[PDB]
Amino acid sequence: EQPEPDMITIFIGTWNMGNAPPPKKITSWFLSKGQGKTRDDSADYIPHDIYVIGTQEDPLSEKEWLEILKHSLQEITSVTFKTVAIHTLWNIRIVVLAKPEHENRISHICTDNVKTGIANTLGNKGAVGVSFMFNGTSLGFVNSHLTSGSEKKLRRNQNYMNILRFLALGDKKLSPFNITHRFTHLFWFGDLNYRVDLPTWEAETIIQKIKQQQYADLLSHDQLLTERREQKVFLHFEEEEITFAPTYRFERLTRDKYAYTKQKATGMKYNLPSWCDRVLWKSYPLVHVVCQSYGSTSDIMTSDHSPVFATFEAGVTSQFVSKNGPGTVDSQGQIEFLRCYATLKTKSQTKFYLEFHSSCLESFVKSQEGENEEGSEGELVVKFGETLPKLKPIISDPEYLLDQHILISIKSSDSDESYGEGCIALRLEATETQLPIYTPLTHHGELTGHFQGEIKLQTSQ
Numbered sequence: 001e002q003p004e005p006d007m008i009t010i011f012i013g014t015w016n017m018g019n020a021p022p023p024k025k026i027t028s029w030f031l032s033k034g035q036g037k038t039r040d041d042s043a044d045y046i047p048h049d050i051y052v053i054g055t056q057e058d059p060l061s062e063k064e065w066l067e068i069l070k071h072s073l074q075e076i077t078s079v080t081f082k083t084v085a086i087h088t089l090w091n092i093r094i095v096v097l098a099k100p101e102h103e104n105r106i107s108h109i110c111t112d113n114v115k116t117g118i119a120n121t122l123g124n125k126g127a128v129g130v131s132f133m134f135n136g137t138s139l140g141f142v143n144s145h146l147t148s149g150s151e152k153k154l155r156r157n158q159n160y161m162n163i164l165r166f167l168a169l170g171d172k173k174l175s176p177f178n179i180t181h182r183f184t185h186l187f188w189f190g191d192l193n194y195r196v197d198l199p200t201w202e203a204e205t206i207i208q209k210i211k212q213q214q215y216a217d218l219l220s221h222d223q224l225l226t227e228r229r230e231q232k233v234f235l236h237f238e239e240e241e242i243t244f245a246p247t248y249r250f251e252r253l254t255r256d257k258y259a260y261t262k263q264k265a266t267g268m269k270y271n272l273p274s275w276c277d278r279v280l281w282k283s284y285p286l287v288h289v290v291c292q293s294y295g296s297t298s299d300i301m302t303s304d305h306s307p308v309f310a311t312f313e314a315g316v317t318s319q320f321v322s323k324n325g326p327g328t329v330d331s332q333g334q335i336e337f338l339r340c341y342a343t344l345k346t347k348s349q350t351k352f353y354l355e356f357h358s359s360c361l362e363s364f365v366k367s368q369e370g371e372n373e374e375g376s377e378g379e380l381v382v383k384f385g386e387t388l389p390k391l392k393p394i395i396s397d398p399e400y401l402l403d404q405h406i407l408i409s410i411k412s413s414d415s416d417e418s419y420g421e422g423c424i425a426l427r428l429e430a431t432e433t434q435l436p437i438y439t440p441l442t443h444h445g446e447l448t449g450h451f452q453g454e455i456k457l458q459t460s461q
């Protein structure tokens with residue numbers, strides 16, 4: 001037998017195809033060749049472990065697109081990839097392909113979609129997603145096509161919050177947790193449709209800057225970067241530095257021209273050159289994740305968007321079995337919390353309790369109610385002191401336990417509704433030692449408070 005991997009590489013692609021069939025060759029996309037952070041030529045024959053393809057305005061049948069994708073990867077790698085999942089909402093599609101050696105490592109495949117907007121605004125924008133387990137590691141993938149238009153960044157932020165609330169991926173037992181907490185690694189990509197927010201009269205200046213590869217002054221006005229910096233969207237997500245030209249809006253059949261001027265076909269809106277097409281991620285604390293490419297193709301010109309690629313190294317763990325767990329506790333293992341308190345932004349006064357969720361526990365654990373005090377600056381402080389239960393992991397082996405994570409929800413005793421969710425890594429500097437812990441708490445992806453204190457982890461070593 002193959003040894004189980006402790007690392008895999010994942011290819012993420014996002015392309016708004018502009019309702020046009022692709023050209024006969026799209027291999028440059030899967031090879032991370034073009035502009036930006038590109039992949040070394042020496043890696044060209046080396047397959048990624050998993051390929052996740054997100055399309056928007058995709059005119060192809062699932063069958064048509066699968067044939068082009070599989071044939072493309074076969075030509076690059078000489079490997080016949082297995083289809084893990086395919087899911088389409090209108091013209092928004094996600095395909096997950098993996099090397100055949102991974103077929104038995106992949107389980108718990110989930111697909112879902114969310115339609116964004118109401119009446120007028122419901123009919124073609126939203127998201128599709130896929131999750132699964134790769135051995136002991138949970139992976140989520142979201143392909144979203146958000147509201148278009150330079151003057152709708154707020155709508156895009158709203159679309160993002162509706163997708164992260166309502167996309168039903170991952171372990172349904174994680175009931176207090178949205179997709180931004182359910183996965184070891186979460187990749188969120190698509191035509192996010194955020195624009196370079198400069199005056200219309202500066203169109204030709206923007207084009208000039210693009211021809212000089214001087215992106216700095218454009219990225220300082222990129223609505224996704226500015227909204228993220230003001231914590232309006234994609235809180236606690238990462239994005240690699242952008243070093244490729246804006247991927248929208250091109251004249252078709254060339255990349256020599258940006259088509260930005262207002263037309264009946266655009267609803268009389270300008271489309272200033274923009275980084276519409278993006279890849280972000282969020283991984284659990286102290287898990288290996290390294291972006292190894294982030295760029296756009298130069299040679300695929302059927303759409304008014306260029307394809308975007310990103311590749312990642314992602315840490316993965318094995319499906320651990322001991323003499324004891326799974327199927328029982330390992331009395332040599334324990335997780336203890338000392339001097340713990342939650343700080344909440346809520347103006348309400350109910351009692352709160354904690355829930356601890358982790359795949360290292362047989363099931364989730366509910367604490368006693370904490371003691372509410374007033375913070376010096378208005379805040380609600382919920383004190384747990386030394387009252388939190390002792391968590392009993394299924395496996396005590398430090399090779400397993402130090403790789404695990406504890407999700408925390410703080411819940412109202414009156415309503416059992418979560419006011420905040422966060423995550424604590426057990427990748428500690430020491431065992432049998434009081435060490436500080438910390439997580440921000442979010443609800444619907446917005447900051448709602450903090451959890452901090454100390455942890456004491458006992459393993460079999």
Ligand SMILES: CC(C)[C@H](N)C(=O)N1CCOCC1
Pocket residue numbers: 088089090113
């Ligand atoms: C399975 C579905 C998501 C299907 N592929 C689809 O896109 N639609 C049917 C339901 O309503 C929206 C349109």
